[PDB]
């Protein structure tokens, strides 16, 4: 039972990076939502900008001493991470249908000219409705400002899911980086798998994906249609990686399902 002004900070609901997320709930009103428990500067700052139904919603902040308290949308619907059975993943329809809203959701995030730097499972949350919404932005940065691109330098994510130039360059675009996470987070909901600790060249399970071995696991379990379309997304070299709007031309993206 703390409390920063009307709200109660009722359950834990998990800790991120840095800081406690807590459900607050309003002692009058009764509206619930989440509250981070803490840079931080800039992090408010991206969160201001975002308005978007597959994006989480940031209501505002109140520092009181120490704790800064950042108030945003509650999704209680859980994480995707949850629908992942592990070795199965999910039937393809619901797998289809959270693909198209972290697309949305991506592609409204690359068009504020911002990446979010660490899209997985667990940072992809659902409303009551099964709504998805990409949450927590304490990694995410601006990559386009005054419709001038600047490449990224920094090392961050997590490393099955990170894109290979992150690994290999010095500096790299930020767009391919988010969309190939998006690709590793494709494959997981369709096989309950991750393909790779890490994508070097050392790693005997990225080896064998460039050497196109899908008679192997993940890829056996995967339909032939959304397959072809991790074959565009999975593509070693950012600059022939497939692009958001061709991934929406992607037959697979389109098919008619359930
Ligand atoms: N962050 C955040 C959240 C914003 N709304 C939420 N609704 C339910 C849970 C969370 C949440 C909780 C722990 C870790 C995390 O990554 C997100 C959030």
Same mark, same amino acid.
């Given at each position: 039972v703390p409390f920063v002004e009307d709200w109660d900070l009722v359950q834990t609901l998990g800790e991120g990076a840095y800081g406690e997320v807590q459900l607050a709930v309003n002692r009058v009103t009764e509206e619930a939502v989440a509250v981070k428990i803490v840079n *931080?500067?800039?992090? *408010?700052?991206? +969160?201001? &900008?975002?308005?978007?139904?597959?994006?989480?919603?940031?209501?505002?902040?109140?520092?009181?001493?120490?704790?800064?308290?950042?108030? &945003?949308?509650? $999704? =209680?619907?859980?994480?995707?991470?949850?629908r992942i059975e592990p070795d199965i993943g999910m039937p393809e329809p619901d797998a289809q249908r959270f693909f198209h809203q972290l697309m949305?959701?991506?592609? %409204? +995030?690359?068009?504020?000219? *911002?990446?979010?730097?660490?899209?997985? /499972?667990?940072?992809?949350?659902?409303?009551?409705?099964?709504?998805?919404?990409? $949450?927590?932005? =304490?990694? $995410?940065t601006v990559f386009r400002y005054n419709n001038r691109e600047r490449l990224l330098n920094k090392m961050c994510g997590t490393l099955p899911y990170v894109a290979p130039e992150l690994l290999?360059?010095?500096?790299?675009?930020?767009? /391919?980086?988010?969309?190939? =996470?998006?690709? *590793?987070?494709?494959?997981? &909901?369709?096989?309950?798998?991750? /393909?790779?600790?890490? /994508?070097?060249? =050392?790693?005997?399970? %990225?080896?064998?994906?460039?050497?196109?071995?899908?008679?192997?696991?993940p890829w056996k379990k995967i339909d032939s249609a959304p397959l072809a379309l991790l074959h565009k997304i999975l593509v070693e070299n950012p600059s022939a990686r497939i692009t958001i709007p061709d991934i929406k031309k992607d037959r697979w993206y389109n098919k008619p399902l359930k």
């Open positions: *931080i500067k800039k992090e *408010i700052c991206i +969160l201001k &900008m975002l308005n978007h139904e597959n994006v989480i919603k940031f209501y505002g902040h109140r520092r009181e001493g120490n704790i800064q308290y950042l108030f &945003m949308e509650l $999704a =209680s619907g859980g994480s995707l991470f949850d949305a959701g991506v592609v %409204y +995030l690359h068009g504020i000219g *911002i990446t979010h730097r660490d899209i997985k /499972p667990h940072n992809l949350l659902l409303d009551e409705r099964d709504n998805l919404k990409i $949450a927590d932005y =304490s990694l $995410a290999k360059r010095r500096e790299f675009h930020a767009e /391919p980086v988010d969309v190939w =996470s998006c690709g *590793i987070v494709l494959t997981a &909901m369709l096989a309950g798998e991750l /393909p790779w600790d890490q /994508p070097s060249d =050392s790693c005997q399970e %990225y080896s064998d994906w460039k050497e196109k071995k899908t008679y192997l696991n």
